Design an enzyme around this catalytic site. Sequence first.
Site, mmCIF file in Angstrom:
data_model
loop_
_atom_site.group_PDB
_atom_site.id
_atom_site.type_symbol
_atom_site.label_atom_id
_atom_site.label_comp_id
_atom_site.label_asym_id
_atom_site.label_seq_id
_atom_site.Cartn_x
_atom_site.Cartn_y
_atom_site.Cartn_z
ATOM 1 N N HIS A 141 7.230 5.084 15.269
ATOM 2 C CA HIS A 141 6.750 6.229 14.546
ATOM 3 C C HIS A 141 6.185 7.324 15.501
ATOM 4 O O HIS A 141 6.544 8.569 15.029
ATOM 5 C CB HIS A 141 5.715 5.375 13.672
ATOM 6 C CG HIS A 141 5.112 6.426 12.593
ATOM 7 N ND1 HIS A 141 5.579 6.618 11.430
ATOM 8 C CD2 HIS A 141 3.965 7.358 12.709
ATOM 9 C CE1 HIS A 141 4.901 7.465 10.637
ATOM 10 N NE2 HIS A 141 3.701 7.991 11.497
ATOM 11 N N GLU A 142 5.113 7.119 16.172
ATOM 12 C CA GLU A 142 4.328 7.909 17.136
ATOM 13 C C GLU A 142 5.267 8.637 18.104
ATOM 14 O O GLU A 142 5.238 9.802 18.178
ATOM 15 C CB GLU A 142 3.120 7.320 17.683
ATOM 16 C CG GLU A 142 2.260 6.736 16.829
ATOM 17 C CD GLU A 142 1.468 7.331 15.698
ATOM 18 O OE1 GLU A 142 1.165 8.792 16.229
ATOM 19 O OE2 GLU A 142 1.442 7.135 14.765
ATOM 20 N N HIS B 277 6.996 11.166 16.141
ATOM 21 C CA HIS B 277 5.758 12.419 16.164
ATOM 22 C C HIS B 277 5.966 13.263 17.249
ATOM 23 O O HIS B 277 6.025 14.423 17.192
ATOM 24 C CB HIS B 277 4.678 11.976 15.881
ATOM 25 C CG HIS B 277 4.311 11.781 14.559
ATOM 26 N ND1 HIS B 277 5.072 12.096 13.182
ATOM 27 C CD2 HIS B 277 3.271 10.872 13.893
ATOM 28 C CE1 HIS B 277 4.428 11.708 12.091
ATOM 29 N NE2 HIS B 277 3.446 10.812 12.465
ATOM 30 N N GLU C 11 5.288 13.270 9.013
ATOM 31 C CA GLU C 11 5.483 11.792 8.816
ATOM 32 C C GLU C 11 6.640 11.127 8.166
ATOM 33 O O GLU C 11 6.887 10.258 8.398
ATOM 34 C CB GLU C 11 4.213 11.465 7.672
ATOM 35 C CG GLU C 11 2.911 11.394 8.351
ATOM 36 C CD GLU C 11 2.766 10.373 9.365
ATOM 37 O OE1 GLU C 11 2.828 9.119 8.453
ATOM 38 O OE2 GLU C 11 2.431 10.054 10.324
ATOM 39 N N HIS D 121 -9.716 10.094 0.984
ATOM 40 C CA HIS D 121 -9.144 11.491 0.967
ATOM 41 C C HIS D 121 -9.904 12.492 0.120
ATOM 42 O O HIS D 121 -9.889 13.458 0.121
ATOM 43 C CB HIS D 121 -7.614 11.446 0.829
ATOM 44 C CG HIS D 121 -6.816 10.635 1.508
ATOM 45 N ND1 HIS D 121 -6.898 9.183 1.881
ATOM 46 C CD2 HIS D 121 -6.168 11.097 2.766
ATOM 47 C CE1 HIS D 121 -6.091 8.769 2.581
ATOM 48 N NE2 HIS D 121 -5.650 9.771 3.277
#
Lengths: 150, 149, 698, 698
Positions: free
Chosen positions: D356-357, D360, D384, D487
Amino acid sequence: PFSEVFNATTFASVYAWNRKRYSVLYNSTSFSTFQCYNVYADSFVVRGDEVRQIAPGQTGVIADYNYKLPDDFTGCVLAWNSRNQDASTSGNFNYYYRIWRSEKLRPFERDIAHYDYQVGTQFKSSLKNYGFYSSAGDSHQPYRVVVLSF
Amino acid sequence: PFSEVFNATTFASVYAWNRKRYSVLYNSTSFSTFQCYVYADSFVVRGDEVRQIAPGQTGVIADYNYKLPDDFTGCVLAWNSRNQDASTSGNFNYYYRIWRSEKLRPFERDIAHYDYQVGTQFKSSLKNYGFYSSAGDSHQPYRVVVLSF
Amino acid sequence: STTEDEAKKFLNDFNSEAENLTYQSSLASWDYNTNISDENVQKMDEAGAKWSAFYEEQSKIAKNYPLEEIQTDIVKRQLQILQQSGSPVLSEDKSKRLNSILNAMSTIYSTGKVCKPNNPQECLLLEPGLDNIMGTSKDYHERLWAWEGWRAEVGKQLRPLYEEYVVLKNEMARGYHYEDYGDYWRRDYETEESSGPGYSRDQLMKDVDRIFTEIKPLYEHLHAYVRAKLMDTYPLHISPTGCLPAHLLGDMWGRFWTNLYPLTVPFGQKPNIDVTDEMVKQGWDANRIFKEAEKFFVSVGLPNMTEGFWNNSMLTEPGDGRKVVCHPTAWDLGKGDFRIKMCTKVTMEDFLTAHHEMGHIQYDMAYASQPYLLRNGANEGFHEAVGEVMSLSVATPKHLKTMGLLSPDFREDDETEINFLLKQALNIVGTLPFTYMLEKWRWMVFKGEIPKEEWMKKWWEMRREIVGVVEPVPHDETYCDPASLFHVANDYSFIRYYTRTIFEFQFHEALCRIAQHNGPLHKCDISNSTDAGKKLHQMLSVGKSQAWTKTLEDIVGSRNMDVGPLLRYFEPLYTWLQEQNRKSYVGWNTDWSPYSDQSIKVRISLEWNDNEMYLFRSSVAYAMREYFLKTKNQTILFGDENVWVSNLKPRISFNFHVTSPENVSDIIPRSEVEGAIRMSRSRINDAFRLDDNSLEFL
Amino acid sequence: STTEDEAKKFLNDFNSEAENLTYQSSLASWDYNTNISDENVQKMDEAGAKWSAFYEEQSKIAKNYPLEEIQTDIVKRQLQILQQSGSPVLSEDKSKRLNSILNAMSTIYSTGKVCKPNNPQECLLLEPGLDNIMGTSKDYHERLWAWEGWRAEVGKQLRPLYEEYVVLKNEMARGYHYEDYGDYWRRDYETEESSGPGYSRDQLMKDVDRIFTEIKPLYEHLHAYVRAKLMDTYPLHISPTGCLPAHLLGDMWGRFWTNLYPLTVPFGQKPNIDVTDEMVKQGWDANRIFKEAEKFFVSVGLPNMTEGFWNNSMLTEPGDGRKVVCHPTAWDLGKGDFRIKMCTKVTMEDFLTAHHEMGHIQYDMAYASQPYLLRNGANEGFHEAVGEVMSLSVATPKHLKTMGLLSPDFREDDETEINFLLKQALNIVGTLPFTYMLEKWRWMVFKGEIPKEEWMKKWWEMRREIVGVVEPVPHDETYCDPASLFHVANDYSFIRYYTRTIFEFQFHEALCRIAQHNGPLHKCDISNSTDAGKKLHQMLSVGKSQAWTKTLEDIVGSRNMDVGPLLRYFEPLYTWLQEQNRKSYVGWNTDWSPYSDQSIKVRISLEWNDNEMYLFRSSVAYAMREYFLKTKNQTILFGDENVWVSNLKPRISFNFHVTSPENVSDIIPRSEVEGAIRMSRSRINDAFRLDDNSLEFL
Ligand SMILES: *[C@@H]1O[C@H](CO)[C@@H](O[C@@H]2O[C@H](CO)[C@@H](O[C@@H]3O[C@H](CO)[C@@H](O)[C@H](O[C@H]4O[C@H](CO)[C@@H](O)[C@H](O)[C@@H]4O[C@H]4O[C@H](CO)[C@@H](O)[C@H](O)[C@@H]4O)[C@@H]3O)[C@H](O)[C@H]2NC(C)=O)[C@H](O)[C@H]1NC(C)=O
Ligand SMILES: *[C@@H]1O[C@H](CO)[C@@H](O[C@@H]2O[C@H](CO)[C@@H](O[C@@H]3O[C@H](CO[C@H]4O[C@H](CO)[C@@H](O)[C@H](O)[C@@H]4O)[C@@H](O)[C@H](O[C@H]4O[C@H](CO)[C@@H](O)[C@H](O)[C@@H]4O)[C@@H]3O)[C@H](O)[C@H]2NC(C)=O)[C@H](O)[C@H]1NC(C)=O
Ligand SMILES: *[C@@H]1O[C@H](CO)[C@@H](O[C@@H]2O[C@H](CO)[C@@H](O)[C@H](O)[C@H]2NC(C)=O)[C@H](O)[C@H]1NC(C)=O
Ligand SMILES: *[C@@H]1O[C@H](CO)[C@@H](O[C@@H]2O[C@H](CO)[C@@H](O)[C@H](O)[C@H]2NC(C)=O)[C@H](O)[C@H]1NC(C)=O
Ligand SMILES: *[C@@H]1O[C@H](CO)[C@@H](O[C@@H]2O[C@H](CO)[C@@H](O)[C@H](O)[C@H]2NC(C)=O)[C@H](O)[C@H]1NC(C)=O
Ligand SMILES: *[C@@H]1O[C@H](CO)[C@@H](O[C@@H]2O[C@H](CO)[C@@H](O)[C@H](O)[C@H]2NC(C)=O)[C@H](O)[C@H]1NC(C)=O
Ligand SMILES: *[C@@H]1O[C@H](CO)[C@@H](O[C@@H]2O[C@H](CO)[C@@H](O)[C@H](O)[C@H]2NC(C)=O)[C@H](O)[C@H]1NC(C)=O
Ligand SMILES: *[C@@H]1O[C@H](CO)[C@@H](O[C@@H]2O[C@H](CO)[C@@H](O)[C@H](O)[C@H]2NC(C)=O)[C@H](O)[C@H]1NC(C)=O
Ligand SMILES: *[C@@H]1O[C@H](CO)[C@@H](O)[C@H](O)[C@H]1NC(C)=O
Ligand SMILES: *[C@@H]1O[C@H](CO)[C@@H](O)[C@H](O)[C@H]1NC(C)=O
Ligand SMILES: *[C@@H]1O[C@H](CO)[C@@H](O)[C@H](O)[C@H]1NC(C)=O
Ligand SMILES: *[C@@H]1O[C@H](CO)[C@@H](O)[C@H](O)[C@H]1NC(C)=O
């Protein structure tokens, strides 16, 4: 007298002392107590408090159950501290003293028996070990005591 | 051609070149760009604008800085120099011209430290390169030597 | 044969094994205290468990030997000590419940937190957080918040635990052939001395009552002076005639008034004695301080510190990675091992504390010749009395001038003597009514004279009539304010601090009389005096081999506790306080409260149980909400917890007053509450099925 | 001359002076994050303050250039980005108040604690303490305590702060020529594309409503299956027809249903895919994991990771004494510097997180050629979405079998596919109604459609009708339940998680179609596919140079957000859920509550404001106290906080129910409360000056 007697690595207890069949003694200056009261040398690793128990005409646990001094003068009393040899951080329980007898001893009577005596309602051993810790007071540090007789 | 040109300790900026009045070059294999199309000019341009040295394009270095004629009779050399011209905290000793009033002709130079107008405030036309050791290949210092015959 | 010979043999065997087991336990405890980690705590646990099992087994064996046959006092005393404490008669579930209750009370006391009204994430513990507020703050409302958050977030937790603890301890003490747990605590100071007048357990209560009645005038004058002094810093909170509020006394319980010294200092321009600068000069270290203390104890004729003491003791904080506890303690490890464990800083307080702990060590070395059961102080106050009397004799300015620590240009006038005596009295005289009253309350609670439904009523009654201290907030039976103290929540006797001061000043007067001191008693130093040291060593040598009354008569010439030396110590301060309390009022009345002026008396005229109290408080809170909404256009969420009930007769009458939400210091004025009751009289009267004649609302 | 040339000069100066100090702020932040110290905070703060001051000054300069006179698209996009955010028009006191409000909300969220009913000294924070309870516990009452202590000791603190924050942010967004703060948040997904249909800010609201209506049946069937499985555990607590209680959803807010997997797993005898044993075997380390990820990304045609990436990035927890933050993050430091900071362990989760990273990072190096303003994702969900679609493609059992981490003896049957799809749906499908509803609530709060007096009423209404989740305890306007989420309390937009899920499966279906995958969509691997990687690199190369609609039409062939790929991904699971939910009820009614069956309807017949509500609750608590004292001989201290009011019409009627003190789960049965009202009816009707006919008490 001899170096083997004084410099013994293993040294006997108060109750079971073993006998054997002078300027260095005067000038050694390590002897805490110097009072002179065949050559036989006896073996005591008594406590520092109990050093005065090796003297004529008195009472005590050593004086009336362990080795006993008669009412006359025969030899010499020597004693020095031994906190480096037979004293440990965890303790050195290798020396025993007799806590009780049925009768008081004769002036030189000795017994190395291992009998149990009556306390309360139980039978307990009459031989109790010595707690000889290095980090202890002067009255509880192990004192290496030799008396002599001819 | 000479070892003193290639192994000079200090190379000046792109806006202010230093001109001077081959098997080693072929077999050195340390040059990232070795395209040709004795005066040797020296620049410490960044990695992404090494291709700007070649003739026939626009940009910032192409027009306002060092500019190549349409026909050329020389070689272009460039190699990565992060070990010398880049630092951990940044090396800001090299400058590039950001703007001129008119487009440059082939092969001229100016040293004038003039200011210019953007927005509402005046600021210098010289901006210093930010050369960091922990940067990418496009943002790394490249010492460029161009020959002209 | 005869049973005293069997008792002698049993005592010899018990001494031989106990001097070993307790030495091993002490070595394990020292190893933990000088080196805090895991795999060190469980060593103490197993050593203490072995020692406790051996002790209770030998106590059960010693219960066989009768005491009335034995005529020799030493073996009789050792057997009495062995038989007084042993295996309790409590069942296994009762003993487990008592241990759980004690652990729960200790954990609640140590880990209890009080959170601020605003910012609920800022919660303060007792020891670093609330103690600093109660010791340093001069704000009435912050001190009130810290005082009321304690005993409500912590004491209310301790109330049912203490209620069960009292019953369990009373049963355990009744199994030891005592009337209650208070009598079991008063089993100390109990002698069987010759000629007939042995000290009984009720004689201690009679004597502490007599001593308090003798110290009442000096404490009354000190109370009047303190009241007049802090009427300046709290101008509209202190009644000139009434008691003092409990939260303005220098700590949360009012035990010591020492922190009130900057507020109540006379002649503030005169500097106090502080030789800390002269010891950060001249290169004074921890070893220099302890060598000076040893020199002081040599000068009176007491023996030197042992060679093992200088080696094994932790005279300073260790530099390596060994965490320790930083509490000054003198350790009698056994077998001639005496050590001091303290983190000595270069301060005058540590200088006096070093002298105090060396006094403890000198007591230990003096009674080390006795058998193991008798190797203690004559009673529980004697040890700390000896430590405090050596600290008293050391701290004189004459001693510091002789040592060269104080500059010889310093001049001792009458102003500095008054400051020193007042600073002494805030710690010595101010703590005596509190200690006496707390022990009296605990004795009456254990005895059963105070029923469970009157604990807080009786406690805050003798606080007013004995200590002269009034609560700022009414506390009903849901609170447990004694349990907010360390010694009450951790099951510790408190009368030893009361008797310590009496014995300390008796010893001071005796030793200053022997040392041929001619001036005032507070300027006396017993240094380089061999007769005073000789009589002190004679007192210290007999640990528990004889009665404490006989030892006291040997040292001071009197068989009873006498507070006359204490009053002779504070005589110039007493005269100065009588001079200063001329325009002021001496004494207090037990009627005024901080909430008393704004309270409204409610007379019940007719089943008004606690549910009716809750309904009344809720109706009053609703009336306050309606009044503040319809009059001041303010939305204030008054609750039933904001209405405080005081002077509650069971069905006759009571008083109530309203405090603001989130500010227990903000008492609503009586006119506002009266207007609130008058505006919303219909709902309040109807909710209890009565008219305005039944509920008077005067 | 022309404004285009001056705008180009200004943009050149801005990016030249922004890349510098952006790299400096990034380097300072990296130095703090890989080496936590108070010294490293100050350099970060200085660099960030310099960058912020430079950014707001250059935004003020950029406001001079008009967007109507420029025709170059790149310059227009950069100038629009510069002009959209800058120095706010808020006053200095208003800006200071807003910053203090944001800091206070963050501090309350991070440091808030919930204490247990018994043992008040045991207080738990949200992150280590309450999260563990909400994720692991299967006890109804412990979960209810954790859920109710949160939003009461924390959310009630955040309610007035959020009330002021909404007004301040609305004023700040109105100063930016926006309707409200929700419109300012929806300023993303706003395009000025050619030919006429540019994406507007209301188009995003219309599209998310359409997407939710399209995903409603699959979520309804998943909700029915989860309700049927959580009717086995938690018996007599779940209605077979009504909604699900909010405290039994796997976490505190019900955001993810992932922790409900052990309770709802079909075919529990089938083991899930876990290659952690095969990587603690074969000598796998963090470098091996990242080299495998680099090999996977190279295999599709994406470039290698840079030499500086291996040199500078923290790919494992440091052995030396350097404190780090153990959160996986991909860093675009600027000037071609890309690093990954994560404490890699040898686990499958860290394997997928590394992929995943690294996705990115691949996005960062793809758009690094763009100017500085355009070096970002096309919208806030694209980054994402790309990371999660790479994680989707790498987690297939076929890829693990090819790599060798999975034994070839493992067989993929239809049962394991259903387990994998359900575990995916609990994280992917279960989070979509929650995200959509929360963003809808925040948009209507900022817009003003929900008044301040109806925040919690509206919030639990759309929780019941959209998420199918009912509250276990009624909450009035003193609560702030959205603010209990991270959030909301930390001022973060939430619709990016909604759009990320749509773009994820859109990209997945497109890339699997390009890579010639013929089987089901959930078993697709895009490895060894140069065409799929080529089109992915074409999508990632344009950062923000063009509209996101144009980039989406380039990669997937559609200009709009489509949830059809998401439904095609879960199609076998949808069929299996439809086959499972034949004997169950699909859907929910918004009337049932855990407290609904035991509530008593009270009808008001005649000024009944909040004070009258308080008086009613107090009278009910008194009646409950009297009933439990006089009937069951029990003393239970009921309070006004133990009476819960629901369905409150302002003056017509309401419902009430009573819970036990210290056990919010223990609801008193309706017959007992009715008997309590009947016994103490006289005081209840008298307290409001009415008879029993007006208050029906049905
Ligand atoms: C990236 O950020 C970093 C943050 O540190 C910046 O690094 C600093 O850059 C400045 C640039 O000015 C640099 O300062 C120079 O340092 C030297 C002295 O310490 C001198 O070489 C130079 O002096 C010139 O500028 C003065 C101020 O204008 C003049 O008075 C002087 O005459 C010098 O001559 C220049 O200016 C005159 C103007 O009249 C002109 O006629 C001349 O031709 C000539 O242009 C600077 O003061 C700092 O030392 C750097 N800091 C560090 C730690 O290295 C970096 O600049 C940023 N990069 C970008 C692109 O913004
Ligand atoms: C302080 O408290 C500690 C508690 O830890 C005591 O530690 C004890 O240390 C003693 C001495 O080391 C240990 O006692 C042991 O008792 C036995 C004595 O002989 C028995 O058997 C003979 C038959 O031969 C009988 O006649 C006699 O009556 C006794 O019943 C021996 O087993 C031990 O001697 C042997 O010890 C070890 C074990 O084999 C060997 O290495 C030695 O060579 C030696 O032969 C020993 O004397 C006792 O076990 C320890 N207890 C614990 C719990 O560790 C301290 O002694 C105690 N001090 C005092 C003064 O009480
Ligand atoms: C302080 O405590 C530590 C840990 O409690 C001691 O470390 C132990 O030392 C003994 C020495 O015999 C070893 O047998 C143990 O294995 C050690 N334990 C551990 C966990 O390492 C340390 O020695 C103590 N320090 C001093 C100065 O006594
Ligand atoms: C009285 O005791 C003190 C110590 O408390 C001694 O005071 C000092 O002793 C040293 C060492 O002999 C002398 O040099 C100092 O002159 C003494 N200072 C004085 C007396 O102020 C003192 O020696 C003791 N008294 C006597 C008479 O010996
Ligand atoms: C809580 O109430 C007290 C008492 O009303 C407030 O403290 C001061 O009270 C005096 C009168 O006793 C007033 O003159 C002051 O205005 C009050 N305030 C201050 C700041 O001095 C106190 O402020 C209230 N609030 C808090 C948070 O303690
Ligand atoms: C981790 O952080 C510490 C503290 O910020 C760093 O220590 C500094 O190191 C620099 C190196 O140039 C010194 O100039 C400073 O004086 C040091 N400060 C302190 C307070 O010691 C440390 O170097 C950092 N570690 C790494 C590996 O970067
Ligand atoms: C498809 O990619 C996989 C890895 O995801 C490759 O699988 C291995 O690749 C190595 C290196 O070429 C080969 O030696 C192995 O034989 C392959 N393993 C298996 C189990 O086949 C695979 O080679 C790639 N496909 C192609 C055509 O290159
Ligand atoms: C709090 O109340 C709940 C609900 O009454 C108690 O939990 C159990 O409730 C069920 C019915 O839902 C009863 O059958 C059980 O007897 C209850 N107790 C247990 C231990 O399972 C709960 O015990 C109460 N107390 C606490 C501390 O949570
Ligand atoms: C105490 O110590 C001093 C200094 O070492 C020494 O001179 C003196 O003899 C000691 N006193 C006794 C009683 O041992
Ligand atoms: C005290 O320590 C010294 C120095 O280590 C040593 O010579 C002396 O014997 C020690 N004395 C003890 C342990 O009694
Ligand atoms: C990527 O790196 C590997 C390993 O060094 C190398 O074999 C491969 O050729 C590289 N690919 C590209 C496209 O540079
Ligand atoms: C990569 O790391 C090696 C080993 O530390 C170092 O020598 C080299 O300079 C680094 N290369 C870079 C940063 O390009």
